[PDB]
Structures are given as C-alpha cells and as structure tokens.
Design a binder for these strands. Structure first.
Ligand SMILES: [K+]
Ligand SMILES: [K+]
Ligand SMILES: [Mg+2]
Ligand SMILES: [Mg+2]
Ligand SMILES: [Mg+2]
Ligand SMILES: [Mg+2]
Ligand SMILES: [Mg+2]
Ligand SMILES: [Mg+2]
Ligand SMILES: [Mg+2]
Ligand SMILES: [Mg+2]
Ligand SMILES: [Mg+2]
Ligand SMILES: [Mg+2]
Ligand SMILES: [Mg+2]
Ligand SMILES: [Mg+2]
Ligand SMILES: [Mg+2]
Ligand SMILES: [Mg+2]
Ligand SMILES: [Mg+2]
Ligand SMILES: [Mg+2]
Ligand SMILES: [Mg+2]
Ligand SMILES: [Mg+2]
Ligand SMILES: [Mg+2]
Ligand SMILES: [Mg+2]
Ligand SMILES: [Mg+2]
Lengths: 183, 88, 124, 139, 47
RNA sequence: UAGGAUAGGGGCCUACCAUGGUGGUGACGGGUGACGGAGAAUUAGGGUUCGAUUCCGGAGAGGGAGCCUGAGAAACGGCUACCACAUCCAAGGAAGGCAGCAGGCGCGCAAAUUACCCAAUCCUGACACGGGGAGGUAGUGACAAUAAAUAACAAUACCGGGUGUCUGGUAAUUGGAAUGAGUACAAUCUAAAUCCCUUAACGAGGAUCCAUUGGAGGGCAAGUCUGGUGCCAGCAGCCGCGGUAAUUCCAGCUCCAAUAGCGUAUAUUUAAGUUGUUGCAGUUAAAAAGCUCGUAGUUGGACCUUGGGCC
C-alpha cells in the first residue's frame, strides 16, 4: 500500500459547453481585460466556486424555515459572505446570496484591492508587483494575485519591509547603476 | 485467512481514535485484554495522541520499560494494552 | 537582532527533559544555525553544558524572517544518551557513525546461514 | 397503453428488458460481436505493410486515395488503411512497421473512400505528422 | 496509379518564413486583445 | 430411523425405509472480455455506464491431489506423487517454483530503479537492544490535479474621443527602476544525501531568458489577401471543395480559439422525451394480433366515529 494515495484531490474549473459564441466571448474578454487576468481559466474557476456556493444556497432555501439543517448552514454561509466582503451589512438573508455574481468575487482579489488602494498605477502593474514579492497582507508576504482578502485584513495591505517600495535596500538594477557610477 | 491477524490498518481503526489519515499505513492493533479492542484506548494512544509525554513508537516503550504506568492498580508494559472504560 | 520564543512548553518528568516548540525571529539573516542557537538556548535556560540541548525539525516560513522547530533540554547528559536515537547523538558529536551497507549485511547473512558450527566466522 | 398498476413492476421491468434490443447501440454493445472485428476492441493496432494500393473516390468525387493494404500482427487479419497528408505514401515502403487507428466514425466508412475504416498513424515508429512537417526522418 | 503521389506539394514554389517581433504572452496578450476590441474599437478583424 | 465421522449441527458418510425436492414469481442449462462490496464518471429530478488496483470479505501460488508439524495450514519464500516446463552433472544421481521487491524475455496500442534505510507507521522474536523489498526515502513520470513567469511605468513620435486642453491607444524609439528562471557561498531539510522554504555574490532590451497546438465556406470565432496546382495532388467527422479567377487543396502574410497545454482513436455519460416509471409512440411516417374464449399475472362500485367537550 502507498499511504500517499489517500490524499483527496479535485478540479476547480469546468470549461463551457458551447466554445464559440460571440456574446459570451466578448463578455469574458471584457471581464479579463479590466480585471487583469491571464486566461479564461482564472475566470472559469471563479464561476465554478460561485456556482458551488449558489447551489448550496439554493438547496438551503428549499428547506423549511424551522429546519435546523437550514438555520445552521444558513448562518455559516452568511458568516462567510460577511467575512469575505461579498454581502453587505444590509443583506443578511439567504435570498441576497443567490444574487451574487462573478465580479463580486473578482473585486476581492488581492490584485484588485492593491489597484484600488492606490498602490498600483494599473491593475496589471498590481499583478506584476504582487508576483514580485512586494506586497504583504498583515505581516505575511503574499505573491499570489488570486489571494482573496477578508474584511479584517483589508486595512493591512502594505509594501513589505524587505521591498524597496516599503523600505528595503535597492534592487540589483539600482545597485548595479551605483556600482557603475562609483568608478 | 488461515489464522489470526496481527496488523491494523489506519483506515480500519476505530473512529474515536482520531488518527491522521496520512500518518502511516498501520495503526496499533489492541492486544488481547479486558476490553473489546473496539471500545478501548491502547496505552500507545495515551502517552501519545492524548498526552505529549511521548513523541514516537520508541519513547512509549522507553517509558513503559521504566514501569511508569500503573493501570487498574498494576504496572503494565504492553504498549497496546486495552484500557477501555473507567480504568484508573 | 534575533529573538527566541518557546511555546507548548512541557517538563517531561517521565523522560527527564523539557520539550518545546521553538520560534526564532531573525530579521536580516537567512537562518540561524543550530550551533549558533544552542548557545543562546543555554544562556536563556541556564544549562551548564551545551550537549543536553537538541534542536531539530526546523523550517523557514514563506517570505522569510522566521523559523520554527522543536527543542529538548536534558537534566543530565547521561540521561540524554539514554532516550534519543543514535543519529541525534551523531549530530552533536556525542557518538560515532558506523559505515555499513544493509544489502552487504544481508549478503553475508544469507551466505553464512548454510554453514553449521564455529566455522561460520571462518568463511571470511 | 401502459400498465400502471402498483403491483406491475415485474411487467414493466421485463418489457423494458425485452425492448432494449431494438436499440442499435445497445444491440451493438451487448451482442458481443465487437470482439470479432479486426481491432478486437482496441483503440489502435500494429501491422505490416503488405502492399500500397489506390482506390478511386466514390461519385460524384473524382480522385485516387492512396491507401495501404496491411496485416495486423495481433490476429493476422488483412485491412486497408488510409494514408493522408499528400506525399505520405512515399514514406511507406514494403513490409514496413505501421501503427493503425480508427478513422473516426466507429466502424464506418469515412468520406468518399469506399469501404475504408482505418488510417495510418505511425510508420516505423515515427508519426506521419512529424515526417510530413519534416520534424523527423524515417530510420 | 500511385505515381502522382505528392505532386502539388513537391511542385509548389517555396517561400521562406518571415521575421517579426514576438507577440506578448499571457496577461499582456489578453491586455492587447482587450485594447483592440473594446478600447480602440470606437467590420471584420481580418478585412 | 439408528449409527460412523467431525471441534461441532447436517445425506457429511453407511444400513434400512418412504417417494419425494425445484420450476413462466423463469427452476434446469448456457454467456460473461464476471471476484463481491464500500465506491467511480456523468448527473434538474429520475437515470445510464463502470467497479483488476492501496479499505472489508473470498480465492490462488504453473495444473490437479494427498499430508506432517502446529493453538491455528489441506501452508507451497513446507513436504510427497503425477502431468507441463526447466537447471547443473564427473551421466551414477541432485535440486526446482517472482500472481513478493528490483530486473529480463515474450505478449502486446499499453506501464519506471537489478538504488538507500529501518529515521517515521507498525509488526514479530527469549527481546527497551535483532529484523522487516511490510513501510518509508531518493530515481524515471505532461496518468490525473493545484498555484502560477514569458514583462510593468514614464518621456518622445504617430493616431483617436470628452479652436483649445485633457483622456485613451501603437512605435526591433529613448529612459530608468523591479524581479525570478538560472548559478552559488551558507544555513536549513534529511537516518545520510537531494528537492522545497531562506539567503551572500552574479544574473534581462530584439529583456534571442525567442509559446505552442489546431483552425480561418456552414455547423463554429476568425480572409470572398497574394503566389502554385487544375475533378490531378489533395481536403473533407456531416453538407461538400478542386474541371485556368479555389474564401475549403499546397504555401506566405494577416486573423481566430484554448494557452503550458492542445490535436487524434477507441470505450460510455450527456445531448436522447431516439428506451420514455417520471416521460415516447401504433388511421396515412415503423408499429392493433383475422376474430372470439381462456388459466397465471395486472386491475377491481358504494357502505360501518361522530357529535365531546377538555384541550
Ligand atoms: K457433524
Ligand atoms: K505453535
Ligand atoms: Mg494475507
Ligand atoms: Mg446423526
Ligand atoms: Mg445409502
Ligand atoms: Mg474472470
Ligand atoms: Mg473489486
Ligand atoms: Mg498493481
Ligand atoms: Mg484484499
Ligand atoms: Mg491458500
Ligand atoms: Mg506464473
Ligand atoms: Mg499447496
Ligand atoms: Mg516466491
Ligand atoms: Mg505465502
Ligand atoms: Mg503510460
Ligand atoms: Mg490557408
Ligand atoms: Mg463565422
Ligand atoms: Mg487562388
Ligand atoms: Mg419516437
Ligand atoms: Mg406505406
Ligand atoms: Mg404503416
Ligand atoms: Mg382489427
Ligand atoms: Mg373500493
């Protein structure tokens, strides 16, 4: 026996049924363009996660109100949404979470928040800065642009101490230029 | 098949032994004893996995051989002795 | 500077030691060597010698500036050489490494299991 | 029409069991004849090029399709395999080593080629695509 | 008759590949696609 | 019924007796490219297909049979015999069982190292201590799967939208900064090594540190551009294209889709309300038996506690 065989594993995107449709292609390209993504997979996985959440919520809403197997996970789902900055404080019902959409999720990505916090000149500059180890959430360096930030950590994104943009020594380009100008 | 089995697979262990699935291929088979081997907590799962006294299947022995464990008013050395309910 | 923080501390009287999870905050350096860390642990825990301290299973956190591992402190060196695996004694120079091959030993065992008597050792 | 009694489960089950046989796909799969085909339920096969032939395309088309008569090594059956990608008949020689695959319609003739259900995929351990694009040379 | 196999490909004229700058890859390729189709698109892409 | 045998019940076997036992609610027999299950894929629901493989149960050690020891075996990394292979040999004899690990031949469309270690999980022995191809570790690995680089910004030149200013877009143009792929002290990892994580020093401008796979008539997103061929060569899953002006073949440019993934072949889930219990059909499209009777099956009129509170 190999114990490593017991590790669960799964897939995170689905691909569309009809591959060549003009309106869907333009919609997806529009979203990719101003959300600074890399391919249609980065958006298909967000759609997949949102579909799972919506299916769970719809299954919950089909049950009777006085059913504990509705109350408990309804509270849990609303707690997760209010924790991730998706649902507002004025939407505390299971019906509002059915109205969620993909741009709600894409608005909470670390790249999107870095761009909207004024730290990046553009949403592509934000992704470049994230992947170059210049951004720390709380105290932890993050170099994953898909990092979904929570509300309590929204006030801690800042350039890292090691980063030249957060008080670090000059990079090899600047140091090479100083070496050239030294002699 | 032709006789008794001396091995217990981790996935076949009792549920109340909350054992990490990727911790190994085998679980400690409880020895023959007072309790039914499915409602028992072997000594290996006491000095380990419940107390941090021992870290491996090498220091449970290193402290049983010192005769440091006295279950039900008697020193016991078998690391898979089945302490099963209300045993002191 | 470098700071050390011990968590999940426990005085194991059964094995006569103290075990803890050790966290090193080391900004400005890649890591802290176990040799450079044993003296710090001794100076902050008042251990007369430097051999009863065993630090292992270290790991640097992603991003850097932090490391964690496990540590053990022994009341006596004689108690230390009674409970640890030999390899940890080797790491601190408290034992000697024996150079041997398992397959060679199995070769010899199979070869000499056919001879009966004191002549087994004669087949060298 | 249908038997709607609550006690009529056996009648419905037996009727459906009998009537599944009129299905073309079900009868194809559950008759067991798929094992008597040359591939014997295999995706690909291997063979020896017996000869190089051409077949006139069916009407209203007019062309000569460069096929190849080959013999499978797993059961000895002789089949004709298409050779696509113009100029790829030159790569095939006599008594040569080829890997054959189905043509695409699951045991049905594809295109205007009369009675050809296989296409040559590899020759002498090299793909026809690599030779056609000059990525590889025949050994 | 198999003597005419590989006729047109063998007898076609040969023109070498051109030389050009490499296109952006990954995120930048989608960036330029979005710019070409939404930003500066104020009717065929290969007219 | 009475014994025999077994650890023990029992036609399990023996003597005697009786004629019973199963079957259209499918016995008996045949096929299975059939080990059974937990489960897998696809799933509006119902469903269809698969289930050799790491968990549970069973069976086997080339094929059958018989048995010793032992608490436990009809054991094969135990014996005895026969059949089939096959190994030395001094030709009198002797020894065999990889469906264990690694490896070889063969078969094939189809599957990796004759490596290290008991450090972990556990098991076994007289035993804290030996041993463990169980198990773990490294090697090969685009089976499958996760995250994710291949550039970002400014100026200048050119061109747009809200005479003018701003906004926005392209240039093997000009600048600077940023960084990891790579290399490498070092420490850490590890039973010992290695990978990762961390990090001195070096490391990007055509940032050559050069993205690919399929297509561009329709289905189906993208060319009635240019050159070649001329019902030939070929393309084409289907419809179809090529007979001197080819939007479909052979190539260049341009463009499109997915993108470190894509194409092709088989099997089967959806699509399929084209298997229809949910939920299909039967005048003419395929499909009411020539007609009636008829047992099993399926299906069968109405009628019998309500006031009565309390609660
Ligand atoms: K009996
Ligand atoms: K025994
Ligand atoms: Mg077994
Ligand atoms: Mg009897
Ligand atoms: Mg009799
Ligand atoms: Mg079978
Ligand atoms: Mg099975
Ligand atoms: Mg296997
Ligand atoms: Mg099994
Ligand atoms: Mg057996
Ligand atoms: Mg065999
Ligand atoms: Mg046997
Ligand atoms: Mg064997
Ligand atoms: Mg065996
Ligand atoms: Mg393979
Ligand atoms: Mg073309
Ligand atoms: Mg179109
Ligand atoms: Mg033309
Ligand atoms: Mg119909
Ligand atoms: Mg008619
Ligand atoms: Mg009719
Ligand atoms: Mg009639
Ligand atoms: Mg009635």
């Amino acid at each position: 026996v190999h114990v490593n065989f017991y590790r669960n594993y799964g897939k995170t995107f689905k691909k569309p049924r009809r591959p060549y449709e003009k309106e869907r292609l333009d919609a997806e390209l529009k979203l990719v363009g101003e959300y600074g993504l890399r391919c249609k997979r980065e958006l298909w996985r967000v759609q997949y996660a949102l579909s799972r959440i919506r299916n769970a919520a719809r299954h919950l809403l089909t049950l009777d109100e006085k059913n504990p197997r509705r109350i408990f996970e309804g509270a849990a789902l609303l707690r997760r949404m209010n924790r991730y900055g998706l649902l507002a404080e004025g939407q505390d019902k299971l019906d509002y979470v059915l109205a969620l959409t993909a741009e709600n999720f894409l608005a909470r990505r670390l790249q999107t928040l870095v761009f909207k916090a004024g730290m990046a000149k553009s949403i592509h500059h934000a992704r470049v800065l994230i992947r170059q180890r210049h951004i720390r959430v709380g105290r932890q360096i993050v170099n994953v642009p898909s990092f979904m930030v929570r509300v309590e950590s929204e006030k801690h994104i800042d350039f890292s101490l090691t980063s030249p943009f957060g008080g670090g020594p000059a990079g090899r380009v600047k140091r090479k230029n100083q070496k050239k100008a030294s002699g | 098949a032709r006789g008794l089995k001396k091995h217990l697979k981790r996935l076949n262990a009792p549920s109340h032994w909350m054992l990490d699935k990727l911790g190994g291929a085998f679980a400690p088979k409880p020895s023959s004893g007072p309790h039914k081997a499915r409602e028992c907590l072997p000594l290996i799962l006491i000095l380990r996995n419940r107390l941090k006294y021992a870290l491996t299947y090498r220091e449970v022995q290193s402290i049983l051989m010192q005769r440091h464990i006295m279950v039900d008013g008697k020193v016991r050395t078998d690391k898979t002795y089945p302490a099963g309910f209300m045993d002191i | 500077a470098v700071t050390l923080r011990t968590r999940k501390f426990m005085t194991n009287r059964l094995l006569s030691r103290k075990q803890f999870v050790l966290e090193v905050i080391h900004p400005g350096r890649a890591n802290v060597s176990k040799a450079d860390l044993k003296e710090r642990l001794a100076k902050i825990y008042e251990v007369k010698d430097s051999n009863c301290i065993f630090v292992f299973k270290f790991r640097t956190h992603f991003g850097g500036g932090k490391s964690t591992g496990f540590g053990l402190i022994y009341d006596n060196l004689e108690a230390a050489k009674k409970f640890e695996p030999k390899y940890r004694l080797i790491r601190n120079g408290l034992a000697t490494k024996v150079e041997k091959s398992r397959k060679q030993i199995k070769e010899r065992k199979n070869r000499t299991k056919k001879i009966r008597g004191v002549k087994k050792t004669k087949a060298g | 029409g249908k038997t709607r009694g609550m006690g009529a489960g056996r009648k419905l089950k037996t009727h459906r069991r009998n009537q599944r046989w009129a299905d073309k796909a079900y009868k194809k799969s559950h008759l067991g004849n798929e094992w008597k085909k040359p591939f014997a339920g295999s995706s690909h096969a291997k063979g020896i090029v017996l000869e190089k032939i051409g077949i006139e395309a069916k009407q209203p088309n007019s062309a000569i399709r460069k096929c190849a008569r080959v013999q499978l090594v797993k059961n000895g059956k002789k089949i004709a395999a298409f050779v696509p990608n113009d100029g790829c008949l030159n790569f095939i020689e006599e008594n040569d080593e080829v890997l054959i695959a189905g043509f695409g319609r699951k045991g049905h003739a594809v295109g205007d080629i009369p009675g050809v259900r296989f296409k040559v995929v590899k020759v002498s351990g090299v793909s026809l695509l690599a030779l056609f694009k000059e990525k590889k040379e025949k050994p | 008759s198999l003597a005419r196999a590989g006729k047109v490909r063998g007898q076609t004229p040969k023109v070498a590949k051109q030389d050009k700058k490499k296109q952006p890859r990954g995120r930048a390729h989608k960036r330029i696609q979005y710019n070409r189709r939404f930003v500066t698109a104020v009717r065929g892409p290969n007219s």
